[PDB]
Amino acid sequence: LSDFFTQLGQDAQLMEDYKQNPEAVMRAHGLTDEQINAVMTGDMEKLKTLS
């Protein structure tokens, strides 16, 4: 989700939270489990598919 990424990149608190507990943060921000999977695997090409 662009919105999540936009926020993550501009909000220091979210950044700090994400770094320690990424899956939870991403879930709380309404990311799908496959989106989270893609991120945690660094599969950017997949994230694009879901953009």
Partner: protein, 257 residues
């Protein structure tokens, strides 16, 4: 009727300056050369009136493409629109279109300025935790380093940019990237051992992605996979030594310093 070129830095959303974002926000029209789709979406959500200059690319000579870009930008300025150009990183570093548009704007008598932004070099210092002031710093374009005479000071941190297209020319294309990189290795070998550790660096675009910081011996450079953005960091191979002459002039000694 004005032109302001701003940079967005390397990271999405976060690395743009406060003022630069304000410029985009209050602009009548915005021309963009951004990397990815997330950047574009961020920009549009900030100001919906955007022209993606990447439409002038081969969907042709880059000069021609660039001309169309500058012309498109100036068209808005000439129309009396408060025009803002949103570029990646620093709008003045490796940015022909930006400089051309500003020059050509000032020439037609329009107000035009460039707002500094965070560059890849800026991200490099931070990511690697290296101070260019530590032992100094030299930056060259890789092809220029190969084509022309540039003797590096091996006490400094040396940066060769656009390493991907190192030594690339119509007459050198019978060679492979690996071949040209091998030639660069031999060149550098004058000052740096074949086992000297060097770093391939690429700043991150997305906040869920990390910068590329690949450490390898110089000798393996030719086998490396390189991206257009790739940069080569070559740390010092010799440690600083005192200028006992200059020291003597000031009557001081290493200890005094």
């Amino acid at each position: 009727g004005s032109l302001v070129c701003v940079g967005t830095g390397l990271q999405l959303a976060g690395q743009i300056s406060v003022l630069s974002r304000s410029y985009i926000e209050h602009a009548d029209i915005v021309f963009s050369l951004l990397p990815d789709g997330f950047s574009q979406r961020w920009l549009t959500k900030l100001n919906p009136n955007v022209i993606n200059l990447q439409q002038f690319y081969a969907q042709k000579n880059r000069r021609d493409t660039y001309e169309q870009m500058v012309n498109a930008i100036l068209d808005a300025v000439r129309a009396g629109k408060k025009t803002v150009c949103a570029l990646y990183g620093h709008p003045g570093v490796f940015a022909c279109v930006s400089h051309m548009a500003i020059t050509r704007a000032k020439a037609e008598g329009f107000s035009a300025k460039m707002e500094p932004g965070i560059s890849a070099e800026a991200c490099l210092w931070a990511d690697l935790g290296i101070d260019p002031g530590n032992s100094g710093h030299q930056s060259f374009e890789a092809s220029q380093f190969m084509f022309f005479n540039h003797v590096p000071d091996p006490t400094t941190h040396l940066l060769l940019w656009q390493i991907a297209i190192a030594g690339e020319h119509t007459l050198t294309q019978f060679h492979t990237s690996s071949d040209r990189l091998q030639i660069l290795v031999e060149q550098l070998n004058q000052w740096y051992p074949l086992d000297h550790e060097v770093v391939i660096y690429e700043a991150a675009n997305l906040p869920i992605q990390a910068p590329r910081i690949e450490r390898l011996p110089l000798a393996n450079l030719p086998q490396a996979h390189l991206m257009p953005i790739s940069t080569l960091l070559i740390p010092p191979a010799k440690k600083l030594e005192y200028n006992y002459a200059i020291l003597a002039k000031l009557g001081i000694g290493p200890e005094d310093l």
